[PDB]
């Protein structure tokens, strides 16, 4: 019962995070910067996280 | 403590730089105070004194308050000694608090000095420190004049001075069951509007009712049902120490139900924490009950479970408690990790790897969480505090609510409960000193007959002896 | 408390909801979806939804703000 | 820019077209002057 | 002046007696509901709301 | 002295006033004041909130009419509220709780006014479905504030105000609600079930339709539950479909039937 | 004299605030407000209701109801705070005071300072004293001198406001 | 006073837009230059007779 | 007339705050304020209210302050912030009406032709419906009884706009009981329904006691409506009704049979798998 309660609570917590877009890179710009193409807007250069 | 002052300093040299100048650096000022408690060895504060300049406001207070635990039981020059160390309201307030810390549970004539020093205080931070030190020094005395002094101080209704007076007014009438004192305290609790006095009285109305057993039920059925959550937290503390020692059926049946059922998180946390003060007489049951509160959806229940496990086992290496804390120190929530670190420190004091096959691993775990440059500040606060507790008193002092004769050690229990209130107020951490009893054995038999004695240990597997190479 | 949690779970998927078009899933608790506003998003799927209904051209109602597929 | 309203010539009001965005009715700044602005004229405008 | 405009849009399938699909003008379509008092039988796909 | 982790207690009346005014203002940002007491350096109390007229200037210091504020304060003093005003709240519909560049300066003026006035941001369209996106801010003048307690990190900041400066130019202060037992179960009367609602017998035709649908769904669930139990062989050891769905179906069906039978029976024997 | 950290609350009172009731026309509120032999004496009977307002909210710590030793000094006083309206004698008889106080002869002397329940006086703006009785049970009660001790609560000027920095004039 | 309160509330921009048919339950419909349709419970500061689709 | 009035959380919280505000210092049997609302069809929706300076004499029941100018300019400013809300009705907290109240309602009628009064008994925290609504009536009574300026009951209920709904729910969250509450809440609701029915029937008892004993005037009305109520009881145990009741109860019984049997089957399926798993672990350990 506690397992289901906990998983529901954490799922509710992550459910607040938004849609995060969808992008496709055309060319990486070395560490961090990296160039990407998103569907409705144009090209951006977006730093990458800890991965 | 002085002659066996073997505290390690490389654990601080690789720590005072490892801290990124956050508020937890002031926590180090506490941690070392645990390690050198009663040893009067402030050389770490003299190895770098300008570093203390980066701990202004209440930290400086706490920093100065540190010296009080540093000179625990000095008693030979303290009144002039504190003035020599600290001749800024935080600073001399912490000096007054430290002076009380030196005279913990042993008032001497310092009470009277405090009794004239406090009345001239500026009704300020200075009064907060003075009231805390005075009440700690005059604990259990139940002297009427000091009690009415703290009555007047409490009736000043200031948030901070009232916070201190809440603890002091319970310390002075500790375990006295004084109906007048508790009546005034609760009447003020239901009448004030600043929550800091509520937090202080939450421990005060518990201190007044220490060890009274069933005599506290008349209180319990009042505080357990009062609508103010701080009052219910106070009721949890009262059922903790009034039923302290005995694993009384009614006490557990009450506080476990309150912890699992109540609507406010803080009362649940404190109710679960209160299990340690009532089950320490038989620590092996505590894992068996807390093993389910230990992993619950509610994180406050989790922190309370960690603290209760740490308190209940005292400094005895129950093994299973560490088995429960091992995943818990990796919990996503920061403050529950901090609580798990504190609990693990509380149990693994004075022990080596052969004595308990976890202590060195937990030492290097503290090492990695204290030097991580992006971990939670509360988690590394717990880490540095744990580093302080592990090597407390130069690896010579132990926390034990049980006295060696089987009697419940009241200074230790009151000190550890007030230390648990560091969640609300950091400077109270020094009260953990009241739980440190040295692990010495003395051969004195006549006047000053301390001769060299050839008694020996009998290590069967191998020699490990003193820790911390 | 589990009743409270599942009540909130039912609440998060209530009106108003913006319709979008389901794209192929990534993982058990997330997938890509293209909102009828035009834009596409990488969005967590509500665990209550039966996975078999997720045909790669399904119309799925999403949280208006968080775009969470509900 | 477009169609200087010029309803009273003490505050003239203008129309602007932000391409593929919108069409607004606006006024001059404290710096620019009515003689400096003509119809069309491809003017610039603040963002809020 | 205190009045606030309302977004116009054509409607689509009703899922239940309360939840409908409305194609807000040229913009995207949403899943919405009737307020409390409006009719329910008259709202058929192709009613300007 | 230097502030601390601090706290801000807002009352039930204040919260409802703020939410109602925000939902009235959307999509145009609206703002007003809260009355309260600087009870101490460690928490600020606000009780009651009054909105003020929406001028065309938008949320700004100029939007604060001095005449309206002064005479509202005088009439509230007459009516029994002498509460001196600290705190201003404004609405940000469509975006998270954070102080915009205008908001920074408005709160700078408000701080210059008293000293410790607190800004409040409410998003009336995101505060929905039982979640309220409320937050409160104060501006900094090295060390942002004194952390002398653990009740500062019991909450977690948000990325939106993080870039907009939730620690950069301003800092967020933990928000608490000072409801009391009298407001409790005074508000609850709103969803409180009536006794006739308790003894209501639902609708027998609709109840039969409900049982008809749920038993058929039970049959269709059990059909694949049979397959699931017939694949008990443990290839590639793997909560979707049959088991827990059957569980919830039996639970709801059984409780509905039991409660309907009990209500019908109680009505039969008690009502004549 | 005074306590430590407190100052006289007299500079914070308001002339528009003073509405002492039942006072003799010859001897008024200003008289008991002065540190002189000038005093207030009641007019109709021993009952005397005196209210005072403050420019800014003030925390009251203690009060000094000094009065003559002729038996006309105040004996039993009800203390009310932050009254919305003017207060009637019948209400004062029936209403529960913020503090019911019984002055002893030592309290009424020129050095007699009476402590107050400081917890209850933290946002006081208007105090009301309901002198109900005197020691000697004299027909009229005399108030030799009376002021309040405490501290201001650091209020602010609501309508002051004013723009300090920023865009100067127009923004979002 | 009312007129000045209206005056402070008629500040640019005005987001020019096209009018659509009127309804009674006197009230207007607007197609924005941003290509979105709005319905107004009240037409606003101008009179219904002057305006037209 | 007016068929219904719906009352939002905001007004009741405002009047609770007003009562605590006044009773804090100036404890009095009641406080009086003004409601703001709007009209749909012939139902009224009230969400706004402000306290007005008011005073009542203890026993003269004719002496009263309600501040004219304060009411007027407070309404004007509340219209400035929100112009939809116009003056409808006035509220007071006294659990009882007074002979003085109809004058208050007549004054309020100057600002609203059909002003409606609302009693909000804040102190009671009891069985239900803490709001009572009353309109002013003056008619010949059609039965030869002398006419009088009278208060007439109009049914009232609590309803919330969505923002007030999320606001109230968030504060109630900790003490909130679940809406579904499969068995526990439903059985408690039925028991509470029996409690409420018993309380109402006992109130009707006490009224009939006072009427037969004569200390309360015979309303002629309602009491004959009460007689219609008494003739409206269904009289179960009529045979075809018994047959239908048995049929429907048996349908419920077979349905609950199916559910219980499936529950037993799934229970056994969990049991067998648990035994298999633990026995597998035991066999592997050796
Ligand atoms: Zn803003």
Swiss-Prot record, chain B:
Function: Component of the 26S proteasome, a multiprotein complex involved in the ATP-dependent degradation of ubiquitinated proteins. This complex plays a key role in the maintenance of protein homeostasis by removing misfolded or damaged proteins, which could impair cellular functions, and by removing proteins whose functions are no longer required. Therefore, the proteasome participates in numerous cellular processes, including cell cycle progression, apoptosis, or DNA damage repair.
UniProt subunit comment: Component of the 19S proteasome regulatory particle complex. The 26S proteasome consists of a 20S core particle (CP) and two 19S regulatory subunits (RP). The regulatory particle is made of a lid composed of 9 subunits, a base containing 6 ATPases and few additional components including PSMD1. Interacts with ADRM1. Interacts with ZFAND1.
Top-rank taxon, per record: Eukaryota
PC repeats: 62-89, 94-127, 129-163, 164-198, 200-233, 234-269, 270-302, 304-338, 339-379, 382-414
Modified residues (N6-acetyllysine): 373
Family: Belongs to the proteasome subunit S1 family.
Gene behind this protein: PSMD1
Protein name per its UniProtKB record: 26S proteasome non-ATPase regulatory subunit 1
Curated annotation (Swiss-Prot), chain E:
Source organism, top-level taxon: Eukaryota
Cystine residue pairs: none
Positions where N6-acetyllysine occurs in the chain: 23
Cell compartments where the protein resides: Cytoplasm; Nucleus
Role played: Component of the 26S proteasome, a multiprotein complex involved in the ATP-dependent degradation of ubiquitinated proteins. This complex plays a key role in the maintenance of protein homeostasis by removing misfolded or damaged proteins, which could impair cellular functions, and by removing proteins whose functions are no longer required. Therefore, the proteasome participates in numerous cellular processes, including cell cycle progression, apoptosis, or DNA damage repair.
Subunit (UniProt): Component of the 19S proteasome regulatory particle complex. The 26S proteasome consists of a 20S core particle (CP) and two 19S regulatory subunits (RP). The regulatory particle is made of a lid composed of 9 subunits, a base containing 6 ATPases including PSMC6 and few additional components. Interacts with PAAF1.
Entry similarity comment: Belongs to the AAA ATPase family.
Protein name: 26S proteasome regulatory subunit 10B
Lineage of source species: Eukaryota, Metazoa, Chordata, Craniata, Vertebrata
Gene for this chain: PSMC6
Interval of the full protein contained in this chain: 50 to 98 of 389
From Swiss-Prot, chain H:
Superkingdom assignment: Eukaryota
Post-translation changes: Sumoylated by UBE2I in response to MEKK1-mediated stimuli.
Compartments it resides in: Cytoplasm; Nucleus
Record-stated family: Belongs to the AAA ATPase family.
Clinical note on disease: Deafness, cataract, impaired intellectual development, and polyneuropathy: An autosomal recessive disease characterized by early onset of deafness, cataract, severe developmental delay, and severely impaired intellectual development. Patients later develop polyneuropathy of the lower extremities, associated with depigmentation of the hair in that area.
Oligomer and partners: Component of the 19S proteasome regulatory particle complex. The 26S proteasome consists of a 20S core particle (CP) and two 19S regulatory subunits (RP). The regulatory particle is made of a lid composed of 9 subunits, a base containing 6 ATPases including PSMC3 and few additional components. Interacts with PAAF1. (Microbial infection) Interacts with HIV-1 Tat.
Protein name: 26S proteasome regulatory subunit 6A
Taxonomic classification: Eukaryota, Metazoa, Chordata, Craniata, Vertebrata
Encoding gene per record: PSMC3
Covered residues, full protein: 75 to 147 of 439
Curated annotation (Swiss-Prot), chain I:
Protein name as annotated: 26S proteasome non-ATPase regulatory subunit 7
Function: Component of the 26S proteasome, a multiprotein complex involved in the ATP-dependent degradation of ubiquitinated proteins. This complex plays a key role in the maintenance of protein homeostasis by removing misfolded or damaged proteins, which could impair cellular functions, and by removing proteins whose functions are no longer required. Therefore, the proteasome participates in numerous cellular processes, including cell cycle progression, apoptosis, or DNA damage repair.
GO MF, one annotated term: protein homodimerization activity
One Pfam family of this chain: JAB
GO CC aspect terms: cytosol; extracellular exosome; extracellular region; ficolin-1-rich granule lumen; membrane; nucleoplasm; nucleus; proteasome complex
UniProt modified residues of type N6-acetyllysine: 200, 210
MPN domain ranges (all copies): 5-140
Record Gene3D superfamilies: Cytidine Deaminase, domain 2 (3.40.140.10)
UniProt keyword list: Acetylation, Isopeptide bond, Proteasome, Ubl conjugation
Subunit structure: Component of the 19S proteasome regulatory particle complex. The 26S proteasome consists of a 20S core particle (CP) and two 19S regulatory subunits (RP). The regulatory particle is made of a lid composed of 9 subunits including PSMD7, a base containing 6 ATPases and few additional components. Within the complex, PSMD7 interacts with subunit PSMD4 through their respective MPN domain. Interacts with TRIM5.
Further comment: Does not bind a metal ion.
Position of the Glycyl lysine isopeptide (Lys-Gly) (interchain with G-Cter in ubiquitin) cross-link: 176
Annotated signal sequence range: none
């Amino acid at each position: 019962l506690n397992a289901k309660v906990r998983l529901l609570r954490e799922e509710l917590q992550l459910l607040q995070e938004q849609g995060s877009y969808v992008g496709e890179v055309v060319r990486a710009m070395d560490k961090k910067k990296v160039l990407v193409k998103v569907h409705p807007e144009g090209k951006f250069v977006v730093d990458v996280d800890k991965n | 403590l002085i002659r066996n002052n073997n505290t390690d300093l490389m654990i601080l040299k690789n720590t005072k730089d490892a801290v990124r100048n956050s508020v937890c650096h002031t926590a180090t000022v506490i941690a070392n105070s645990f390690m050198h408690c009663g040893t009067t060895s402030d050389q770490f504060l003299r190895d770098n004194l300008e570093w203390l300049a980066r701990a202004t406001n209440w930290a400086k207070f706490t920093a100065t308050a540190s010296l009080g635990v540093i000179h625990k039981g000095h008693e030979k020059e303290a009144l002039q000694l504190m003035a020599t160390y600290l001749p800024s309201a935080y600073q001399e307030g912490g000096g007054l608090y430290a002076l009380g810390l030196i005279h913990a549970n042993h008032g001497g004539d310092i009470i009277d000095y405090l009794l004239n020093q406090l009345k001239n205080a500026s009704n300020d931070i200075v009064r907060h420190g003075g009231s805390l030190g005075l009440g700690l020094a005059a604990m259990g005395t139940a002297r009427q004049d000091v009690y009415d002094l703290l009555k007047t101080n409490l009736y000043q209704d200031d948030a901070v001075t009232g916070e201190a007076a809440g603890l002091a007014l319970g310390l002075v009438m500790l375990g006295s069951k004084n109906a007048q004192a508790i009546e005034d305290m609760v009447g003020y609790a239901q009448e004030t509007q600043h929550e800091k006095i509520l937090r202080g009285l939450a421990v005060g109305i518990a201190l007044v009712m220490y060890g009274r057993m069933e005599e506290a039920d008349a209180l319990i059925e009042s505080l357990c049902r009062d609508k103010d959550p701080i009052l219910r937290r106070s009721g949890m503390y009262t059922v903790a120490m009034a039923y302290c020692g005995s694993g009384n059926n009614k006490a557990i049946r009450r506080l476990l139900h309150v912890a699992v059922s109540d609507v406010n998180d803080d009362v649940r946390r404190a109710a679960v924490e209160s299990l340690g003060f009532i089950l320490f007489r038989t620590p092996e049951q505590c894992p068996s009950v807390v093993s389910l509160l230990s992993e619950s959806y509610n994180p406050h229940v989790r922190y309370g479970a960690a603290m209760a496990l740490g308190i209940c086992c005292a400094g005895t290496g129950n093994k299973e408690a560490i088995n429960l804390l091992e995943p818990m120190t990796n919990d996503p929530v920061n403050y529950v990790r901090q609580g798990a670190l504190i609990a693990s420190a509380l149990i693994m004091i004075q022990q080596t790897e052969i004595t308990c096959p976890k202590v060195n691993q937990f030492r290097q775990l503290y090492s990695k969480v204290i030097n991580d440059k992006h971990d939670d500040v509360m988690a590394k606060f717990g880490a540095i505090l744990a580093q302080g507790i592990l090597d407390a008193g130069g690896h010579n002092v132990t926390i034990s609510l049980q006295s060696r004769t089987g009697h419940t050690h009241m200074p230790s229990v009151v000190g550890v409960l007030v230390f648990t209130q560091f969640w609300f107020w950091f400077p109270l951490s020094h009260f953990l000193s009241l739980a440190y009893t040295p692990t010495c054995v003395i051969g004195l038999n006549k006047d000053l007959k301390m001769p060299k004695v050839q008694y020996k240990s009998n290590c069967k597997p191998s020699t490990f002896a003193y820790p911390a190479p | 408390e589990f009743l409270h949690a599942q009540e909130e779970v039912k609440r998060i998927q209530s009106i108003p909801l913006v319709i979008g078009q389901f794209l192929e899933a990534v993982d058990q608790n997330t997938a890509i979806v293209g909102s009828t506003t035009g834009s596409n998003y990488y969005v967590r799927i509500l665990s209550t939804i039966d996975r078999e209904l997720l045909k790669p051209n399904a119309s799925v109602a999403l949280h208006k703000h968080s775009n969470a597929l509900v | 820019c477009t169609k200087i309203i010029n309803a009273d010539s003490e505050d003239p009001k203008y129309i602007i077209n932000v391409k593929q965005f919108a069409k607004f009715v606006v006024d001059l700044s404290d710096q620019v002057a009515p003689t400096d602005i003509e119809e069309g004229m491809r003017v610039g405008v603040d963002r809020n | 002046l205190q009045s606030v405009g309302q977004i116009v849009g054509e409607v689509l399938k009703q899922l239940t007696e309360e939840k409908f699909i409305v194609k807000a003008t040229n913009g995207p379509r949403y899943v919405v509901g009737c307020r409390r008092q409006l009719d329910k039988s008259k709202l058929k796909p192709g009613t300007r709301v | 002295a230097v502030d601390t982790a601090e706290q801000v207690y807002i009352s039930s009346l204040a919260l409802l006033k703020m939410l109602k005014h925000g939902r009235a203002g959307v999509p145009m940002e609206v703002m007003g004041l809260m009355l309260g007491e600087f009870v101490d350096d460690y928490t600020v109390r606000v009780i009651d909130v009054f909105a003020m007229p929406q001028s065309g200037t938008g949320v700004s210091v100029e939007a604060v009419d001095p005449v309206f504020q002064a005479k509202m304060l005088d009439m509230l003093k007459q009516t029994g509220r002498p509460e001196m005003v600290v705190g201003w709240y404004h609405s940000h519909p469509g975006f998270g709780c954070w102080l915009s560049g205008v908001d920074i300066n408005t709160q700078q003026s408000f701080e210059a006014l008293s000293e410790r006035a607190v800004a409040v941001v409410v998003d009336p369209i995101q505060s929905v479905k039982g979640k309220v996106v409320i937050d409160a801010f104060r501006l900094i003048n090295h060390e942002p504030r004194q952390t002398t307690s653990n009740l500062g990190h019991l909450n977690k900041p948000s990325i939106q105000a993080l870039i907009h400066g939730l620690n950069r130019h301003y800092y967020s202060i933990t928000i608490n609600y000072r409801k009391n037992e009298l407001e409790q179960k005074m508000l609850l009367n709103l969803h409180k079930k009536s006794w006739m609602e308790g003894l209501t017998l639902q609708d027998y035709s609709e109840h039969c339709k409900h049982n008809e649908s749920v038993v058929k769904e039970m049959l269709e669930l059990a059909k694949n539950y049979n397959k699931a139990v017939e694949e008990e062989d443990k290839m590639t050891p793997e909560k979707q479909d049959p088991k827990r769905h059957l569980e919830e179906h039996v639970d709801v069906l059984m409780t509905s039937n039991i409660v309907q039978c009990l209500a019908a029976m109680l009505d039969t024997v008690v009502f004549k | 004299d005074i306590p430590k950290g407190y100052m006289d609350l007299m500079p914070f009172i308001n002339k528009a605030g003073c509405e002492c009731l039942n006072e003799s026309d010859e001897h008024g509120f200003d008289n008991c407000l002065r540190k002189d032999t000038t005093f207030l004496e009641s007019d109709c009977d021993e009952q005397l209701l005196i209210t005072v307002a403050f420019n800014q909210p003030v925390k009251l710590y203690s009060m000094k109801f000094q009065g003559p030793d002729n038996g006309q000094g105040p004996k039993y006083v009800k203390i009310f705070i932050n009254l919305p309206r003017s207060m009637d004698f019948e209400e004062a008889e029936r209403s529960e005071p913020t503090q019911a106080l019984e002055l002893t002869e030592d309290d009424i002397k020129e050095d007699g300072i009476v402590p107050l329940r400081y917890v209850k006086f933290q946002n006081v703006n208007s105090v009301t004293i309901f002198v109900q009785s005197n020691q000697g049970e004299e027909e009229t009660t005399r108030i030799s001198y009376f002021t309040f001790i405490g501290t201001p609560v650091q209020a602010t000027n609501m309508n002051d406001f004013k723009r300090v920095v920023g865009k100067k004039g127009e923004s979002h | 006073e009312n007129s000045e309160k209206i005056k402070v509330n008629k500040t640019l921009p005005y987001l020019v837009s096209n009018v659509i048919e009127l309804l009674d339950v006197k009230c207007a419909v607007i197609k924005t230059s941003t290509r979105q349709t709005y319905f107004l419970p009240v037409i606003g500061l101008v009179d219904a007779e002057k305006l037209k689709p | 007339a007016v068929q219904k009035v719906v009352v939002h959380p905001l007004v009741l919280l405002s009047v609770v705050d007003h009562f605590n505000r006044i009773g804090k210092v100036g404890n009095q049997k009641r406080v009086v304020g003004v409601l703001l609302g709007s009209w749909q069809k012939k139902v009224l929706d009230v969400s706004n209210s402000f306290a007005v300076p008011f005073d009542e004499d203890d026993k003269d029941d004719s002496v009263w302050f309600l501040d004219h100018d304060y009411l007027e300019n407070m309404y004007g400013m509340f219209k400035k912030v929100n112009a939809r809300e116009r003056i409808v009705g006035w509220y007071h907290t006294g659990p009882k009406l007074h002979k003085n109240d109809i004058a208050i309602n007549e004054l309020m009628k100057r600002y609203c032709p059909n002003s409606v009064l609302v009693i909000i008994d804040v102190k009671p925290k009891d069985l239900g419906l803490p709001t009572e609504a009353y309109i002013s009536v003056e008619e010949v009574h059609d039965d030869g009884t002398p006419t009088s300026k009278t208060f007439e009951h109009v049914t009232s209920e609590i309803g919330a706009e969505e923002a007030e709904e999320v606001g109230v729910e968030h504060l109630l969250r900790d003490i909130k009981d679940t809406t579904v509450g499969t068995l526990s809440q439903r059985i408690t609701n039925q028991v509470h329904g029996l409690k409420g029915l018993n309380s109402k029937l006992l109130d009707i008892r006490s009224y009939l006691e006072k009427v037969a004993t004569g200390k309360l005037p015979i309303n002629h009305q309602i009491i004959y409506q009460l007689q219609d109520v008494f003739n409206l009881l269904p009289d179960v145990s009529l045979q075809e009704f018994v047959k239908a009741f048995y049929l429907k109860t048996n349908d419920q019984m077979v349905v609950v049979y199916l559910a219980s049997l499936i529950r037993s089957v799934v229970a056994l399926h969990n049991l067998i798998n648990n035994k298999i798993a633990n026995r597998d672990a035991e066999k592997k350990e050796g």
